[PDB]
Amino acid sequence: MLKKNDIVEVEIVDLTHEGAGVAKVDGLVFFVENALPSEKILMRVLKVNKKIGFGKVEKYLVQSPHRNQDLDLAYLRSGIADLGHLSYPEQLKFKTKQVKDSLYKIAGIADVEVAETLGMEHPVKYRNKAQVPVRRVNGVLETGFFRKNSHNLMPLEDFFIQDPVIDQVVVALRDLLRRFDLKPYDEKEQSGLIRNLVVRRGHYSGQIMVVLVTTRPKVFRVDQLIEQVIKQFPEIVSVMQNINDQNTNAIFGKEWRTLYGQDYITDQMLGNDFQIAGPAFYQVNTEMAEKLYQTAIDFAELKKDDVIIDAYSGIGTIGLSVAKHVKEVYGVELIPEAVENSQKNASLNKITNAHYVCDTAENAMKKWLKEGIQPTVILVDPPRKGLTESFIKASAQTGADRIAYISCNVATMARDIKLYQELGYELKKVQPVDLFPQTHHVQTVALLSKLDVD
RNA sequence: GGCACGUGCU
Ligand SMILES: Nc1ncnc2c1ncn2[C@@H]1O[C@H](CSCC[C@H](N)C(=O)O)[C@@H](O)[C@H]1O
Ligand SMILES: [Zn+2]
DSSP, rough: OOTTEEEEEOOOEEEETTSEEEEETTTTEEEEEEEEEEOOEEEEEEEOOBBBEEEEEEEEEEOOBBBOOOOOHHHTTTTOOOOBBBOOHHHHHHHHHHHHHHHHHOOOOOOSBOOOBOSSSSSSBBBBBEEEEEEEEEEEEEEEEEEETTOOOOSSOOOBBHHHHHHHHHHHHHHHHTTTOOOOBBTTTTSSEEEEEEEEEOOOTEEEEEEEEEESSSOHHHHHHHHHHHHOOTEEEEEEEOEEEEEEEOOOOOOOEEEOSEEEEEETTEEEEEEEEESOOOOOOOHHHHHHHHHHHHHHHTTTOOEEEEESTTTHHHHHHHHGSSSSSEESSSSSSHHHHHHHHHHTTTOOOOOEEEHHHHHHHHHHTTTTTTOOOEEOOOOTOOOHHHHHHHHTTTTOEEEEEEEEHHHHHHHHHHHHHHTOOOOEEEEEEEESSTTSSSEEEEEEEEEEOO
């Protein structure tokens, strides 16, 4: 048949959503990491199931003219920048094409124009949050990253796609942790203290939250450590602790503590102040997220009498940025620390017509329906699993004219759009936005409406 | 190998 270590010549014909590398050998589809369309390779077979996968490039016979040859990127490719080996112009085209192909294949839609993916002018150094594991390598505490489905620390200081100030803070903390003899975590032994660093920095404000993810609550001399990090980075307004005593892949455990300062940072979006807790969600590309939100707000054509639902509201960024131009805003968020942020953020921006609830989107929608709230627009911003059929049905029963769907996954978006079409909402506009350059993640704004005029 | 309600997308 074909055996688990064979070398065979193959032509790469397509890219998967995740940035492999599609070939056909014998009868089977193979996924090859770091292989682009139009390339001819010798492929080393890693794994043979029926009727899929998986190979590795042994040799390039012909390379793609769109391949980025940067060796520094090539080390990041599996961990940080999934698509860094493809040129930026082709990353955008690839993301546009995926949206088109999803709407066609899954929802039957071919009659609607999908705009060209809106790209970032300087598609680098954009992330406002870093999550970095801390491990012992050759008896020395090292920071870096993990590759896909691996737990072997790849040392790294320059993360390519994050705020260089965050890189500096991580390195400074790495060196400080060494100077205070704090032991790093070891997954094999379950020994040590420091598991992870999470560092968030406001894109406009520059304010920094450091999170130390530890196995135990007591961190010897941590207050003296903090005094010194604050001295080199006065922008740090918050140092949090998160305790994770389990042996799991999850970064955070249940318990949070405040070690210094506040339990939030403040950053600006669309000219408003937002407080952001450690466990709350905040878009990591603040620049492009503004364009994403502005796109959705423009799609919605909000007027002074509109009633908006901001579902999957987070810290209230979308809803609060429109509440002064609108009659009422109703929002729902699952994470309590984010809902508490959104309530404070309303007060903070002198907003009196926002109503945030801590629930599941689906049974908040059900409550608002039973309470007789009459929304005219529904803004949704779900995670990758999309909306539940229960939410879609319920949102539609309100009779809201416009729905503005912000997606981070085209497969689930297209599924949900299909059901909205069945319920009388026509897909009107689609604008992909590149929130995560150099990665496989695609972000889309869709406008669905039941008005023939839009 | 992953993902979405024993096949559907990747
Ligand atoms: N079933 C659910 N109901 C309500 N919120 C949910 C949820 N599942 C996930 N969430 C939350 O929904 C958000 C998805 S990301 C969007 C957040 C926000 N609109 C912003 O862009 O800033 C996160 O805040 C996540 O914690
Ligand atoms: Zn994805």
